[PDB]
């Protein structure tokens, strides 16, 4: 149907935006910390901590997929890269600290790109 292919162009759009919007919240990791999965081979006990890992290969492959249906779900795999990172490390380490300053810079990100969701209507 037409109305089917019109809400196709809409989740195209706003992953669209949100491959750009991923491009700047990554760019605010220059140190690539958040870039892959933490490796279980390296980390053996990380799900015993952590039961939802994310990183941003992971975002990328979802993002290409257009399985964010909207922001609110993008974002609450950002929130989890940051989230999990705060809980396994300590305050006192360059993970931890990393975080802090990608959720710090990655607000400011995220503040526009809902404005700009609601405002094309891309939900
Ligand atoms: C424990 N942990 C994190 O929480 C986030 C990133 C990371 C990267 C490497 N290479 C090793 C461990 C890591």
């Known amino acids: 149907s037409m109305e089917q292919v019109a809400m196709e162009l809409r989740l195209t759009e706003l992953t669209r935006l949100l491959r750009s919007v991923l491009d700047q919240l990554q760019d605010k990791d220059p140190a690539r910390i958040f870039a892959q999965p933490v490796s279980l081979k390296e980390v053996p006990d990380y799900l015993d901590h952590i039961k939802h890992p994310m990183d941003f290969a992971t975002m990328r492959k979802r993002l290409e997929a257009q399985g964010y249906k909207n922001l ?21 380490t360059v993970f931890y600290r990393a975080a802090v300053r990608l959720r710090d810079q990655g607000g400011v990100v995220l503040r526009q790109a809902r404005r700009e969701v609601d405002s094309i209507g891309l939900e």
Request: include cysteine.
């Open 72 to 92: 609110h779900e993008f974002e609450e795999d950002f929130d989890l890269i940051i989230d999990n990172c705060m809980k396994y490390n300590a305050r006192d």
